[model samples]
Target: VKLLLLGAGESGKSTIVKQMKIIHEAGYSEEECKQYKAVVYSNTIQSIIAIIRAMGRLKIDFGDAARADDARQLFVLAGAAEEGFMTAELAGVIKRLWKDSGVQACFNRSREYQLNDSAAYYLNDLDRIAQPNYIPTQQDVLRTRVKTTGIVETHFTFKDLHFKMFDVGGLRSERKKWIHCFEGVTAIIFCVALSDYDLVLAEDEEMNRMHESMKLFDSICNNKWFTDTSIILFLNKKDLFEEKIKKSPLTICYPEYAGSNTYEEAAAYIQCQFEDLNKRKDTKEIYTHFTCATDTKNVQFVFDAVTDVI
Candidate 1:
């Protein structure tokens, strides 16, 4: 199956990309290994400025909480491959997660300044929740750098199905250029943070990207190319839903995939989680999945689902 993932710059695209690697290693194969097509990396000047502008608009203070002794954050400014290549290396990041909320949040909140701040946050959360994972220290922060890509080769399988995957930039500036690739896509992997309850509760909302994202949903759904297309809504960080949280991914989603419990016993509980999420989307959603990219074979499940649809 060929797949294309669209979302914000840091929206777990890399982690999902790493998930694809899991899929391939588990038996999925690449139809092609052509060198990735090249594109100029978007300069960070505009994004840096936009972040400053967003901070001003949101009225959030920049330096209030941080102390001088606190380690500095890193920013991924630009590179030879830009968004396209970075999107491809994202596939392998899953192996690095202790418990994936940090990973999930890293992608979700990646666009914020101090490019590696989210990565740092992920490391910090790992230490807090999964203490054995690592201790966040001055070395951890001081050694940080934005992830980059050198070569990207997306793969798809044809075992009773076929697919072409493209991981597009979720940043506003880079999204406009995706029009050229929309001609034959069979599924749209549209992701959003399920935890973002603020917008839903606020009735006095004005024009904003959330509204714009809603509009884009309509546009994609209405497109002729998208008419028969399946929409896969991935709620990436469902594992972080910790009314009764645990440090172990195994303990968290126990018996569902890794159940001391059987799949038969856990199926109902898992389905309920899906049903609840569907309600949250405000539609009896046609298709979706709730899985962490951090757990074993989580990425594998998504790759298989996309193949089944495509």
Candidate 2:
């Protein structure tokens, strides 16, 4: 069987791929895990830089007058250099500055800026990760955020059934190339970031990420080429969605959403947005699941149910 995973960028498609590896392929090697250390450190530095810059633009200051200058110098230096190749000393400075009250305060308002879901995960563990002999665990590799640029195919056997999973790039420039891979697929696993109601696409800042996702689903569902393909909706990132919905309301993106601030009501409303598209578009059978893509148990249970349905 062949399954195509589609979603807007950062919608947890890659994490799902990692989870499949853990379940079927026995997970990554220590050597393979080590490659993500620099990327994770880079992500942590970039997140802090964004928060500090947002604070400066909003005229928000660190609570401590003395540490404010120190944080400012660190932020400037972080921005001036390439974070992906940062040295251990530079990473140490970032770790110390991140603990400042003002910096912490700015990070609290991270929803206002564009920060990745993995930011909180890696930033909280910089001490161990910044060491010279550090190695990333399976969880660290799964939580690390890296943008997919092209199509990735993973072939494995699960439950004695041969499976081919395709992870497609979700950026705009990458969409035109999707047509080449659309042929010959048994199922389509459509992923949506439920927490993206408050965020915008990294490629085009003017477009809301969730709104773009709705439009993409509309197009994919309505396409004549995929009329016979099985379509399943994975409302992913439930953990982040639950956390974000409290800080940022669903009404901000969809004003018509009268449902209260509860996760159930908000999630149901968002699920309807996609299901409603299916009804008006091609009218295929679309199965839906609320998934926290990082959780091995959650994904295993969801995939088992999905395979049964298929």
Candidate 3:
């Protein structure tokens, strides 16, 4: 089977690929963990810098005035290092700064600004990431955000099936590369972040991320090149969406969405958004699933259902 994974930035396509490695191939060895150490450190620092910038824009300050001393040191420390590898000295300032309530306050409104979904995961696991004998775990590898710049391929077999997954980058710039690899395939796995209703694209702040997915989905489904191919739509980040709905309104993305703000209504409406993107819905077969790719068990179940469909 030839499976082509599709999704916009931070939409969990890469996480799904990493999950495949864990489920199909043997789990990462110690050496692979070490290799990911640098990436995780970079991921950690990126999250910190993004939060600080958001705090500045949000006009929020450190909870404690004295912690401002530790916060400035973070920038200095980041500038001096090749990659933001954690150290005893760095951890002292980072730990102090992270505890500040103002930063936490700004983090709650991260949808207002651009930030990686894995930012919270790395910051929460600070203690383990800070030690001298540091090595990232399977999830640490999964949570780390290394943007997909080019096409990535992985091969595995399950129950008399030969699976060749082509995970491609989904950013505006990355889409150009997809045409080069756009040959016939078994199916196109379209992953869209369900919680991104209030978020905007990193490249173009004026464009909403959800709308970006809408455009991409329309193109993929309507293209005659993929008429015979199927689309497996993964409405990803269901975990994030459920938590966000209570606090934020879907009206932020859908001005016309004036219905109740419950999770069921909100998710159903968003799913309908994509489902209707295909002008000829009957001409194409789209199998959709609500997924949280970071959860290994959840992904395993979804993967089985998807494989069964294919």
Candidate 4:
């Protein structure tokens, strides 16, 4: 059966595609392994660069005066992201930069600007990721953030069901191409990054990511184009959401949000916000799974549950 995975940009759509490849199909090949190596490095280069730029723009000084020299050197390698290259010495520069107190202050306000979700994840593991023969593990592969540009499909089977999954690019402009799919899709998996309530979109800084996702889900969940298709909602990034809610309140996006702010109370409130948008509740069904797509067993279990819904 044909299945479409849909979500707002950076909302774990591509990671779901990668998870299934690890679970239901074979692991990454030689080329696939090296491809992620490039991605891991490029993310590191860009992540640190964004931190330094934001530090200067925000008028913060390096905790150590000598680290100013490190910032200057980092800028010279700024173009490394375009080529996906980083040297061992450069990796050491990032390690020291990451240690600066001023850099840490800027990173804490990372939501005010932009930074990779996996910046800290990869940066922490730089001692391992920046090696000469460093090969990525499944977790590293999942954490790498190379934005999707075109359609990505994975053909596989779970028990007796054959799933032909499609991940159409999730950017607003790329969404229009979704209508080109053949008419036989069996289900649509709609994903949302729950931690994004306090985050802004990379497209339009004024637009909240969670708000944009809710609007997209409203139209597509209620759209007549695929009325017959099963609607499965994956509230993804539960791991990050649970961690983030302790610090950032949900009220940033939902101004009226009044809850205990624990994961249970907060998650249910967000779910209700989307479920309330279903105009066809009398005619259609919406199934939800609180997922962390990067975790193998969690996604493995989610797919098993999603199978019956499909």
- Residue-level lDDT of model 1, residues 236-280, one tens digit each, is 545443321232232322234554333333434444444343322
Q: Which lDDT tens digits does candidate 2 get at residues 1-310? A: 9999998888888899999889888889988987886777667777877877898887787766766666656655664234344456666667777777887888887767787788778878876776667787888888888888878999888777889999878888778777777879898999999988988788877888899999988888777888888888999989989978876878779988888888998899999888888754545778899999999999999999888776
Give the candidate number with the greatest lDDT. Answer: 4
- Sorted on TM-score, best first, the list reads 4, 3, 2, 1
Tens digit of lDDT per residue, candidate 4, span 54-140?
998899989999898888877776566446566777887889999999999999999989888998998888888877777778888
On lDDT, who's better, 2 or 4? 4
RMSD per candidate (Å) reads: 12.4, 2.6, 1.6, 1.6
Positional deviation of 133 in candidate 3, in angstroms?
0.6
Please list the residue runs of candidate 3 whose C-alpha ends up more than 4 Å from where it truly belongs after superposition: 79-84
Off by more than 4 A, model 4: 77-85
lDDT rank, highest first? Answer: 4, 3, 2, 1
**Model 4 has how many clashing residue pairs?**
0
Q: Model 1 clash tally?
A: 18
In candidate 3, position 171 carries an lDDT of 78
Tell me the whole-model lDDT of each prediction, alpha carbons only: 0.41, 0.82, 0.85, 0.87
Alpha-carbon runs more than 4 Å astray in model 2: 72-92, 280-283
What lDDT, from 0 to 1, does candidate 2 have? Answer: 0.82
lDDT at position 115, candidate 1 = 33
